[PDB]
Amino acid sequence: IVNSHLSELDEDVFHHFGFTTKSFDFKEKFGDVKFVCVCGSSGRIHNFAISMAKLAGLALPVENIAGSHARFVLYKVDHILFADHGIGIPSTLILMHEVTKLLYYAGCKDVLFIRLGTSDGLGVKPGTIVLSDRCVNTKLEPYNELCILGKPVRRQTKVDSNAVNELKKLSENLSVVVGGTITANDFYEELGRLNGSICTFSKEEKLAFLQSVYDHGIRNMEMEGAAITSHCYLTGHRAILVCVTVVNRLETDEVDEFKLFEQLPGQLVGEYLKRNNGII
Amino acid sequence: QPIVNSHLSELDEDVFHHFGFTTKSFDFKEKFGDVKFVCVCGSSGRIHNFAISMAKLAGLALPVENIAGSHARFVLYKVDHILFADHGIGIPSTLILMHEVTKLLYYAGCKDVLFIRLGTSDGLGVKPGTIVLSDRCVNTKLEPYNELCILGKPVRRQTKVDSNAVNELKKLSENLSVVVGGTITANDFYEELGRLNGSICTFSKEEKLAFLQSVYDHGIRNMEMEGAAITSHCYLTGHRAILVCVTVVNRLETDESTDEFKLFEQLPGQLVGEYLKRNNGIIVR
């Protein structure tokens, strides 16, 4: 589906990237992109871009394509774009809008979006990589909910099951678990944490909620999945979540090794990108 | 009297993961006990500069120390009775800040603290560069609520702004344009704010205008993405909140000079700074 309104613009400003459609030719600069790698922070995604560059044999430093003062960073190593989305669905939706618009202008078709994040684990020990076989909200519905012009809109989530299949098969020759993922808007109360500044439920209700979602296949929880997987589906691209778990929420709320866990998703996806020509 | 989360007493040590410190990091009573203001905005650089401007005003020697961990998600500064932090973009990011900052205030025994958001925003029927003092914070249906889904169950939390602080800021500006009006909080910069140049648009330019005109006639003068989170969380934790946002675009005209934008961003700080100087936010030495 195409936004007809874009073709009417004399110039289109990427407010959060720091450039416009008069900055450069998008086809020439981005036309070969087939993958988009994203995580929460600029630092981590830049480190991964650098890591991927070394794997491809790129000597020169990986340079920010985005404006220096812009909200998000943007790196490119061969056929891969790297960017940060911050914390939460709204921040992520901004990135998704501007990155998919970028892909549209560049003529990129059927691009795989990969989120390499961290997450709360359910019934798995910390350090476990969860490959999301589905992304659902806190009601375990595979939908991202929006209020557009004051009207309720539900947009269903979808994961590239083929990519999950590949990543899981690949991981065996290189622990990795395939399971469901909850996306929430509140790190504390909506994720059943007891140590927020506000708590309107008991431990019993918290555990009943966390056990039920586990029983219904959920293995991890985070705050951006529903946005990425729903937005990609609608704009003609693909999406997967590769997140390491940093805590078993069926056991506790609170959390060197943390930095080590963060490296794990990149180690898996990097090998995937190598064997599926994200790099030359 | 503020409601206390009893579960916090069950913890021997509490970790502020997004600030990168714990309850053993400082003596919270001695370190934060005199905090009566918390200033927040979207970026670490902007709020750092504002903290620096307040320190200069207070006659305090630079630099302003980031109390937060070096690799933490958020920054945290203190100048006399004011804390400074960034909240990033959107309600989820902001809610995390609110939880950890209000917990900090609790451990430090701080009561009735005033949260001030110094942001930029979409304008409605006002020229770019206009400071909107929010007298009302609502969602995209123009209801004064932040909606949540707690353990799968729908929750609506009422929003509230400090009218007295708003009134004081208004009168202060007269002796220093500033408009008092409604504020919409949305969860999406593009479609939910009625922008036509997203990657997805399921509405016409006619429907767009109707939506924005409607909210304008209902008193809304600006739109941003964090308001309902701040004002509802403060209400529940026994604190106060206001929004002081400069508008950068009049959405009733268009959806689209970097120098004057930098000038615009300075405006909320200039107003708020004067308020803090006269209301025991800083001590002038």
Q: Can you give chain B as a three-state secondary structure string?
A: CCCCCHHHHHCCCCEECCCCEECCCCCHHHHHCCCCEEEEECCHHHHHHHHHHHHHHCCCCCCCCCCCCCCCCCCEEEECCEEEEECCCCHHHHHHHHHHHHHHHHHCCCCCCEEEEEEEEEECCCCCCCEEEEEEEECCCCCCEEEEEECCEEEEEECCCCHHHHHHHHHHHHCCCEEEEEEEECCCCCCCCCCCCCCCCCCCHHHHHHHHHHHHHCCEEEEECCHHHHHHHHHHHCCEEEEEEEEEEECCCCCCCHHHHHHHHHHHHHHHHHHHHHCCCCCCC
Whether residue B207 lies within 8 A of chain A, CB to CB, comes out as yes
Helix (H, G, I), strand (E, B) or coil at A36: strand
The answer to whether the beta carbons of residues A189 and B95 sit under 8 Å apart is no
- DSSP codes, A47-92: HHHHHHHHHHT--SPPPP-S-TTSSS-EEEETTEEEEE--SSHHHH
* A187:B139 CB<8 A: no
- By Cβ distance, the residue of A41, A153, A189 closest to B148 is A189
A138, containing H or E segment: none
Q: Which chain A residues have a beta carbon less than 8 Å from that of B190?
A: 93-94, 97
Cβ atoms within 10 Å, residue B45: 12
Going by the DSSP 8-state scheme, the letter that residue A219 receives in this structure is: E
Q: Which two tokens stand for residue B251?
A: 């959405």
Our CA angle for B42, A71, B148, nearest 5°, is 50
Query: CB within 8 A of A165, min separation 6: which ones?
Result: none
Q: Looking at CA atoms only, how far is residue B17 from chain A in angstroms?
A: 8
**Can you name the residues that pair with B154 across neighbouring β-strands?**
B149
The answer to whether the beta carbons of residues B52 and B78 sit under 8 Å apart is no
A10 → chain B, closest CA residue: B256
The answer to whether the beta carbons of residues A86 and B88 sit under 8 Å apart is yes
For the packed helices B44-57 and B258-278, what is the interaxial angle rounded to 10 degrees?
A: 40
Whether residue B220 lies within 8 A of chain A, CB to CB, comes out as no
Q: What is the span of the domain harbouring residue A6?
A: 1-280
Q: For residues A136 and A122, what is the distance between their CA atoms, to the nearest angstrom?
A: 15
Helix (H, G, I), strand (E, B) or coil at A100: helix
Q: Which residue has the tokens 């300075």?
A: B266
Going by the DSSP 8-state scheme, the letter that residue A15 receives in this structure is: T
Q: Which residue has the tokens 């019993």?
A: A204
End-to-end CA distance of chain B: 34
* A41:B73 CB<8 A: yes
The answer to whether the beta carbons of residues A47 and A56 sit under 8 Å apart is no
CA-based nearest residue to A226, from A151, A132, A150, A152: A132
Whether residue A55 lies within 8 A of chain B, CB to CB, comes out as no
- DSSP codes, A147-197: EETTEEEEEE----HHHHHHHHHHHHH--EEEEEEEE-S-TTGGGT-S-SS
Distance of CA A200 to the CA centre of its chain: 30
CA-based nearest residue to B29, from B104, B84, B96: B104
Give me the phi and psi of A165, to 5 degrees please: -55, -45
- By Cβ distance, the residue of A91, A97, A194 closest to B190 is A97
* A254:B11 CB<8 A: yes
- By Cβ distance, the residue of B151, B233, B236 closest to A201 is B151
A212 → chain B, closest CA residue: B151
Sign of the alpha-carbon dihedral angle for A133, A139, A141, A146: negative
Whether residue A115 lies within 8 A of chain B, CB to CB, comes out as no
Q: Which chain B residues have a beta carbon less than 8 Å from that of A205?
A: 151
Residue B87 sits in a domain whose CATH number is 3.40.50.1580
Cβ atoms within 10 Å, residue B61: 8
* A96:B211 CB<8 A: no
Q: For residues B274 and B110, what is the distance between their CA atoms, to the nearest angstrom?
A: 23
Helix (H, G, I), strand (E, B) or coil at A1: coil
For the packed helices B91-107 and A89-106, what is the interaxial angle rounded to 10 degrees?
A: 150
The answer to whether the beta carbons of residues A249 and A221 sit under 8 Å apart is yes
How many interchain CB pairs under 8 A, A with B? 189
* A185:B149 CB<8 A: yes
Q: For residues A155 and A170, what is the distance between their CA atoms, to the nearest angstrom?
A: 31
Q: What is the torsion angle, in degrees rounded to the nearest 10, for the CA atoms of residue A194, residue A196, residue A198 and residue A200?
A: -20
Sign of the alpha-carbon dihedral angle for A175, A181, A182, A185: positive
Best mutation target among A148, A233, A235 (most B Cβ atoms within 10 Å) is A148
Q: For residues A147 and A145, what is the distance between their CA atoms, to the nearest angstrom?
A: 7
Q: For residues B41 and B117, what is the distance between their CA atoms, to the nearest angstrom?
A: 6
Q: For residues A249 and A70, what is the distance between their CA atoms, to the nearest angstrom?
A: 35
The answer to whether the beta carbons of residues B128 and B248 sit under 8 Å apart is yes
Whether residue B176 lies within 8 A of chain A, CB to CB, comes out as no
Kindly provide the b/e burial profile for residues B110-133, where b requires at least 16 CB atoms within 10 angstroms of the residue's own CB.
beebbbbbbbbbbbbbbeeebbbb
Whether residue B5 lies within 8 A of chain A, CB to CB, comes out as yes
Number of separate domains in chain B? 1
Best mutation target among B188, B232, B261, B264 (most A Cβ atoms within 10 Å) is B188
CA contacts within 13 A on the Cβ side of B136? 16
CA-based nearest residue to B117, from B220, B219, B268: B268
Cβ atoms within 10 Å, residue B188: 24
Q: Which residue has the tokens 């932090």?
A: B85
The answer to whether the beta carbons of residues A77 and A61 sit under 8 Å apart is no
Q: Which two tokens stand for residue A227?
A: 């946005």
